[PDB]
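INTERNAL TRANSFER SHEET
From: sequence group
To: structure group
Subject: Proteinase K

Please process the attached sequence and return the structure record in the designated field. Keep the field labels unchanged so the import script can parse them.
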Amino acid sequence: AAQTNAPWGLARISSTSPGTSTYYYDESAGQGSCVYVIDTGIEASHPEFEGRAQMVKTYYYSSRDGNGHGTHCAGTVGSRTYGVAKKTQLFGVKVLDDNGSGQYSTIIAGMDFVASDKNNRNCPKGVVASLSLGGGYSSSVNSAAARLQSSGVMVAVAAGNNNADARNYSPASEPSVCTVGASDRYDRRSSFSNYGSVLDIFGPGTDILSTWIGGSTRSISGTSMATPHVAGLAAYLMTLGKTTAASACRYIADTANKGDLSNIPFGTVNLLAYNNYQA
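Return from structure group:
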């Protein structure tokens, strides 16, 4: 399948070169997979989600996304126009308040929630969790991410936006999950992207168009935007049967575009997520 005039990041993940604008992908499109977006919520009524999104958990007075961040991330995972995996099922877990903030205890509870809640959902092709959040190093936060991954969920986490080594941030620094840095449309490391040996992969993160609250759209930047590209890619590849939740991060690294990004610090992987789809 081909989506013309796609957001640059979608085009990038199906291309061996920057500078194109059509997204190519197998029509299975992540059908039968599920992606949890652990964030500020999801505006499930957005036409872009087509009834495939729902809120399943909140720790606050509402499950609605009063911020936009979670809706944007969910859109990059799975919206019809802005999403990688256009037929996946999206589940929102609101661990962040409408200012985008959340306590680590709530975030940990949300991860353990997903590890159990997937047993209440129909995801025959597999389960992914996208965590566009983080703060300073916490062994308890890392352990929660490791449990979620161990339970059979492909965990993708943002590297962080500090232009610093991600070893000092959580859950970015957890070795067993997939830690995602950000790149721009010219294959440069995004100016704010964290780096370091803990990174597993880069995805598009600068000037990413996606869904927003109020039934709208906007372009924003962050490792928060790169992470759902990888989460959606994992769901898509799991639906194709090419990999599993336990092996998808390694598979994405195996099949990535290699050595094509600029300003990658010595010791950080030079790997850009790629769907290897041959039309």
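Handover comment: Residues 2-272 form a domain with the Rossmann fold fold (CATH 3.40.50.200). The chain has one domain: 2-272.
Transfer complete.
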